[PDB]
Write a protein that binds this ligand. Structure first.
Ligand SMILES: [Ca+2]
Ligand SMILES: [Ca+2]
Lengths: 118, 118
């Protein structure tokens, strides 16, 4: 679920930045997502958006799915069983890893998505 | 539950030390629960053992309790508000913070607790 995703983000970036910092970023991080991502981190979110889309087509509610995961060697690691739990956990762990490698750019945080996204 | 606790430990210590390093340490970290704690870290585990005993007496199974928690700016924070979930979460959050500020001394890892703990 989304609280677990936030926990994963902190795991992957070794506490370098709070997970709330990623909640409304670029064109894709946060509600909806449209246009060309504005930078590397936003590209992570576009991928994540598409993964949640694919989870939804498989009958999952990715914001709600309660999976099992472990922060090990600074990598979010899915324990979960198959199905939605495995699938959504994979979406989140992947995004967490992607966020962690990408540079955070404050100028791209909380942007006017109607003006900058398409 | 124990997996979540491991995740809290990584949250509080910014992933600087694996969770397993704390599973058999001193007289109190892990299955042990007797004698005089061997150092500052071991004292954290003594407090955590006491907390788990209190949880049990509240009717909780602390190793199993499945709570809701958020790693917020490197601080494990309980979201669960009532019952065993909130109480056990608090035990774990406090220990995770305690572990992160205590110095780890490998000479106290995996000691013979039958011999050194009373
Ligand atoms: Ca989005
Ligand atoms: Ca113990």
């Amino acid at each position: 679920n989304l609280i677990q995703f936030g926990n994963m983000i902190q795991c992957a970036n070794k506490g370098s930045r709070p997970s709330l910092d990623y909640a409304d970023y670029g064109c894709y991080c946060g509600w909806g997502g449209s246009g060309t991502p504005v930078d590397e981190l936003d590209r992570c979110c576009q991928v994540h958006d598409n993964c949640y889309e694919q989870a939804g087509k498989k009958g999952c509610f990715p914001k709600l799915t309660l999976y099992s995961w472990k922060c090990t060697g600074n990598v979010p690691t899915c324990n979960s069983k198959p199905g939605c739990k495995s699938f959504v956990c994979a979406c989140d762990a992947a995004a967490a890893k992607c966020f962690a490698k990408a540079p955070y750019k404050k100028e791209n945080y909380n942007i006017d998505t109607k003006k900058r996204c398409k």
